[PDB]
Amino acid sequence: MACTIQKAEALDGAHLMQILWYDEEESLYPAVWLRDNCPCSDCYLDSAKARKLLVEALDVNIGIKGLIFDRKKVYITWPDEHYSEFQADWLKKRCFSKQARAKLQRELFFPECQYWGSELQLPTLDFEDVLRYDEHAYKWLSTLKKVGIVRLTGASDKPGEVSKLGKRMGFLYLTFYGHTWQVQDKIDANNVAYTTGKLSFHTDYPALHHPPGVQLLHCIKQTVTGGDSEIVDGFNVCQKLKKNNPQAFQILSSTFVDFTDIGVDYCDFSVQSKHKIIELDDKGQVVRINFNNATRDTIFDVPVERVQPFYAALKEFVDLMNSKESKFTFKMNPGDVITFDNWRLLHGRRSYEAGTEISRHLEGAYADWDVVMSRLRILRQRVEN
Amino acid sequence: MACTIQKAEALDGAHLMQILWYDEEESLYPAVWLRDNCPCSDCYLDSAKARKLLVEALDVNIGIKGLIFDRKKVYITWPDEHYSEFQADWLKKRCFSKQARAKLQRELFFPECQYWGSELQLPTLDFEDVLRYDEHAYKWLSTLKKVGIVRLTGASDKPGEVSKLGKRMGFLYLTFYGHTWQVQDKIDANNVAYTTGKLSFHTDYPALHHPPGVQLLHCIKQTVTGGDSEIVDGFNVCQKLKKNNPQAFQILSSTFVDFTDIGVDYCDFSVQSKHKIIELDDKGQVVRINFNNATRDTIFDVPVERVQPFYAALKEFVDLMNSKESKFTFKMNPGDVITFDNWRLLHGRRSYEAGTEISRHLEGAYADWDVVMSRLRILRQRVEN
Ligand SMILES: CN(CCC(=O)O)[N+](C)(C)C
Ligand SMILES: CN(CCC(=O)O)[N+](C)(C)C
Ligand SMILES: O=C(O)CNC(=O)C(=O)O
Ligand SMILES: O=C(O)CNC(=O)C(=O)O
Ligand SMILES: NCCCCCCN
Ligand SMILES: NCCCCCCN
Ligand SMILES: [Zn+2]
Ligand SMILES: [Zn+2]
Ligand SMILES: [Zn+2]
Ligand SMILES: [Zn+2]
């Protein structure tokens, strides 16, 4: 009854097609949108699933010249004698009602998040299962998206595991630190990450205008002298900050902060960016947190009077991150991999002791969220079919 | 006189340091910013050029406890007995006056653009010179940034040339179409690019939330039956659109359009994005154009009443691109490479004739603007020194 056509007709100077479905619901489709989306082989390249029709070919004032229908299809003639057929279910799916558009957006983008604090139960899967089974890899990425982190257990204690995950997704995101990189204490460290020092809460690579969406971190070797991990849900923290300190929230979401990274690794580099620490979409929703205190530049491009208040805002934000209600602490063991949303979570590390041998070794890599969502969409189709 | 200190003192409850320079100009530096940016080995990791100091260590209400100076340095004691030294020239550079901040921003980001229409003189350099000489590679990237395109002549007529350029920059941007990709007519084409059809003006890869910043395109083989290239300066076009049709400008800069790409190439993929076609920064300046008509989805997530007006806006925008005043047409020959800003220009191709042999073959690749600007900054330092 819902995807079956009871009536189709041209309305409103023939600029609109209305469909009455057999459940009695009605849908409206602009004539211009129908012509733009003709699936015939002139207008649409089936092998690419792409529009061939040019904007230049489109009469924005077009109306339907003729229409007939049956229960599964509408058949339209256009004023220039072009002919189009549309399938009922295709049409139903692309209905312009708020409810139908939102439903489809949820299927495309998996928007649901579960916010968390110190009460987090760390979602956990087996590494080899994830590589072997689509049901597991599907659980992995959907949970990555929804919760922001998934731990995988049972990997080897050897380099190369994050690469296997990268291929399972599709491919890893290359940066100046390499395809993969080794988190360990290094002489003449080009990055505070490559020391035994404490890392306070940060996101990786705000020095790039497009920071890595997803981070993978694999414990090869762990130390007993420190080195615990800490995470916090940045979206949860920002919500608490907006409520507790609207003014600190307004400063962090409007102030451009300069980030910098100069050195040599995969390549020689001199990198500069500007970001709002709390990044809002056009509807005011937090979509990304951009913050590493190590790489925040000495250069600070704001008027002198805005400086101290910026710092006071940042301090509030960091205190919230550090609160016992927000943060979750755990310690990785050899064979553990964490995969997390590097746009939403902040992460850190406790200091540990330097020594003559390497007491501690992680391998990390990055992936792009579009690459991950692509794999998530394909996996879902496979597991539901 | 300008970088030499005549007087330094603590003011405003010691929350501010003022410097009188020997030219009689004055600079103010917040106490919090000075402490945050202490260069001592406790606070700052010289090998990484990164801040070690945590936000948690910073008293946002700090004032200077004591200060002395000489002509090249200030020496500060803090209330908790921490001690800092700052160099005059370091301080002068990071002055918070609007003029000093803007000057430094120009050095970091190379913001200048030369807008153009059909009168464009296509900037042109030799390929091997660019690979061999920093003076040339510097001219290449600075002109790429400023004008939005540079043509390189004298490459081979063989695959692998865009890779050489990728390494000269640093590295290429991997996508689902590969590290490099071959633009030629293909059976079961996964993309309208891989046919003999006309490509109207578009940017590449709006199906990604972070489209490629820079595109490289190398003519291996060219056809006499068509296949001319066309470019347009999208920033120039948007400026003309805002003026001629403010309403069309407002619709294209505020409406989220869905892009899609589903298929198999480097990997299997199902990619989805949303973008405003004319993307504005927070000050209302156009920073990116996101538009490929082939990959614009059938799904269109707006209320029914906004549909036809969107199409009318888009049509105006495309007509402007196609105007004889805006567009620049040229034809690539074997050995030519074009490198251009894929955020600013739109590009296209005239149709040509199918046949049994391959009459036409380009190799393309992408690079990220941060990778390109990094190389641009390093090159400048080398060529000026
Ligand atoms: C880039 N990075 C994270 C820290 C940073 O943002 O500088 N590595 C761990 C890869 C060094
Ligand atoms: C992705 N691409 C450009 C066209 C597109 O945006 O789909 N290739 C030329 C690489 C096919
Ligand atoms: O060493 C760790 O536990 C975590 N590392 C990082 O967050 C990093 O290298 O940026
Ligand atoms: O074939 C050409 O001349 C230009 N190609 C493209 O713009 C493309 O492949 O997206
Ligand atoms: N079953 C309806 C077929 C209509 C074809 C019309 C061609 N102009
Ligand atoms: N030339 C000035 C040196 C000042 C050192 C002060 C240490 N507290
Ligand atoms: Zn058609
Ligand atoms: Zn990190
Ligand atoms: Zn110090
Ligand atoms: Zn293209």
Which CATH number characterizes residue B7's domain? 3.30.2020.30
| DSSP 3-state of A12 | coil
Q: Parallel, antiparallel, or unpaired for β A124-126 and A149-153?
A: parallel
Identity (one letter) of the amino acid at B325? E
Q: Final residue of a domain: which of A97, A127, A158?
A: A97
The reply to whether B227 and B288 lie within a common domain is yes
Identity (one letter) of the amino acid at A73? K
| DSSP 3-state of A121 | coil
Task: Match 């023939």 to its residue by tokens.
Answer: A14
The reply to whether A29 and A103 lie within a common domain is no
A70's tokens = 């049956």
**Angle (deg, nearest 10), helices A134-147 and A369-384:** 130
A380 CA: distance to closest CA in chain B (Å): 11
Q: Provide the annotated binding site of A.
A: 38, 40, 43, 82, 202, 204, 347
Per-residue DSSP letter, A265: S
The reply to whether A148 and A112 lie within a common domain is yes
Q: Measure the CA–CA gap between A35 and A43, rounded to whole angstroms.
A: 9
A301's tokens = 């491009």
- Is B197's CB within 8 Å of A52's CB? yes
The reply to whether A120 and A192 lie within a common domain is yes
HEC string for chain B: CCCCEEEEEEECCCCEEEEEECCCCEEEEEHHHHHHCCCCCCCEECCCCEECCCHHHCCCCCCCCEEEECCCEEEEECCCCCEEEEEHHHHHHCCCCHHHHHHHHHHHHCCCCCCCCCCCCCCEEEHHHHHHCHHHHHHHHHHHHHHCEEEEECCCCCCCHHHHHHHHHCCCCCECCECCEEECCCCCCCCHHHCCCCEEEECCCCCCCCCCCEEEEEEEECCCCCCCEEEEEHHHHHHHHHHHCHHHHHHHHHCEEEEEEEEECCCEEEEEEEEECEEECCCCCEEEECCCCCCECCCCCCCHHHHHHHHHHHHHHHHHHHCCCCCEEECCCCCCEEEEECCCEEEEECCCCCCCCCCCEEEEEEECHHHHHHHHHHHHHHHHC
Q: What are phi and psi of B339, to 5 degrees?
A: -125, 125
Q: Measure the CA–CA gap between B321 and B231, rounded to whole angstroms.
A: 9
The reply to whether A182 and A168 lie within a common domain is yes
Residue among A186, A191, A338 to mutate when testing ligand 1 (max atoms within 8 A of CB): A191
Q: Parallel, antiparallel, or unpaired for β B229-233 and B214-221?
A: unpaired
Beta-bridge partners for B4: none
Mutate to test the interface with B, among A26, A29, A47, A110 (most CBs of B within 10 A): A47
The reply to whether A379 and A271 lie within a common domain is yes
Q: Measure the CA–CA gap between A347 and A203, rounded to whole angstroms.
A: 7
Q: What are phi and psi of A181, to 5 degrees?
A: -145, 155
Task: Check if the beta carbon of residue B223 is closer than 8 Å to that of residue B353.
Answer: yes
Give the structural domain span for A29. 1-97
Task: Check if the beta carbon of residue A253 is closer than 8 Å to that of residue A351.
Answer: no
The reply to whether A67 and A189 lie within a common domain is no
Q: Ligand 2: list residues with CB < 6 Å.
A: B 177, 181, 191, 193, 204-205, 261, 292, 295, 364
Q: Which residue in B30, B355, B360 sits closest to B184, CA to CA? A: B360
Per-residue DSSP letter, A159: T
Q: Final residue of a domain: which of A97, A114, A147?
A: A97
Ligand with minimal distance to A227 CA = 3
Q: Is any ligand 4 atom within 6 A of the Cβ of residue B193?
A: yes
The reply to whether A109 and A86 lie within a common domain is no
**Angle (deg, nearest 10), helices B246-254 and B304-322:** 110
Q: Is any ligand 5 atom within 6 A of the Cβ of residue A330?
A: no
- Is B272's CB within 8 Å of A109's CB? yes
Q: Measure the CA–CA gap between A381 and B59, rounded to whole angstroms.
A: 53
| DSSP 3-state of A111 | coil
Q: Which residue in B115, B140, B143 sits closest to B130, CA to CA? A: B140
Q: Would you say the C-alpha torsion B248, B251, B254, B255 has a positive or negative sign?
A: negative
Q: Measure the CA–CA gap between B105 and B373, rounded to whole angstroms.
A: 13
The reply to whether A6 and A102 lie within a common domain is no
- Resolution of the solved structure (Å): 2.2
Counted domains in chain A? 2
Q: Provide the annotated binding site of B for Zn(2+).
A: 38, 40, 43, 82
Of A29, A197, A311, the CB nearest to B58: A311
Q: Final residue of a domain: which of B49, B64, B97?
A: B97
The reply to whether B103 and B242 lie within a common domain is yes
Q: Measure the CA–CA gap between B95 and A186, rounded to whole angstroms.
A: 34
Q: What are phi and psi of B219, to 5 degrees?
A: -80, 115
Task: Check if the beta carbon of residue A28 is closer than 8 Å to that of residue A96.
Answer: yes
- Is A262's CB within 8 Å of B54's CB? no
Here the CATH number for the domain that contains residue B174 is 3.60.130.10
CA B55 vs CA A129, A310, B32: distances in Å: 41, 12, 11
Encode B174-205: b = buried (16+ Cβ within 10 Å), e = exposed.
Answer: bbbbebbbbbbbeeebbbbbbbbbbbbbbbbb
B80's tokens = 């908790």
Q: Is any ligand 5 atom within 6 A of the Cβ of residue A75?
A: yes
Q: Compute the distance from residue B349 Cα to the ligand 4 centre, in Å.
A: 6
Q: Is B205 left (phi over 0), alpha (psi -120 to 50) or beta?
A: left
Q: Which residue in B378, B298, B277 sits closest to A271, CA to CA? A: B378
Q: Would you say the C-alpha torsion B209, B213, B219, B220 has a positive or negative sign?
A: negative
Of A189, A209, A266, the CB nearest to B48: A189
Ligand with minimal distance to B73 CA = 6
| DSSP 3-state of A153 | strand
- Is A200's CB within 8 Å of B268's CB? no
The reply to whether B72 and B134 lie within a common domain is no
Q: Compute the distance from residue B56 Cα to the ligand 9 centre, in Å.
A: 14
| DSSP 3-state of A263 | strand
Q: Which residue in B221, B185, B201, B172 sits closest to B322, CA to CA? A: B201
**Angle (deg, nearest 10), helices B134-147 and B369-384:** 130
Gyration radius from chain A CA atoms = 26
| DSSP 3-state of A385 | coil
A127's tokens = 């590494």
Three-point CA angle A18, A19, A20, nearest 5°: 125
Residues of B in contact with A189 (CB under 8 A): 45, 47-48
Task: Match 């890779």 to its residue by tokens.
Answer: B163
For ligand 5, atom 3, which residue shows the shortest CA distance? Answer: A75
**Angle (deg, nearest 10), helices B304-322 and B234-244:** 120
- Is B308's CB within 8 Å of A96's CB? no
| DSSP 3-state of A24 | coil
Beta-bridge partners for A199: A349
**Angle (deg, nearest 10), helices A234-244 and A304-322:** 120
Q: Which residue in A327, A190, A306 sits closest to A248, CA to CA? A: A306
Q: Parallel, antiparallel, or unpaired for β B345-349 and B199-202?
A: antiparallel
Q: Measure the CA–CA gap between A325 and A317, rounded to whole angstroms.
A: 14
Could you tell me where the DSSP H helices lie in A74-155? Answer: 88-93, 98-109, 127-132, 134-147
Task: Match 């005549």 to its residue by tokens.
Answer: B6
Residues with CB under 5 A from ligand 8 (ion): A 204
Q: Is B42 left (phi over 0), alpha (psi -120 to 50) or beta?
A: alpha
The reply to whether B153 and B163 lie within a common domain is yes
Contacts of residue B43, defined as CB under 8 A and 6 or more positions apart, other chains included, come to B37, B51, B52, B53, B84
Task: Check if the beta carbon of residue B157 is closer than 8 Å to that of residue B334.
Answer: yes
Q: Measure the CA–CA gap between B349 and B353, rounded to whole angstroms.
A: 13
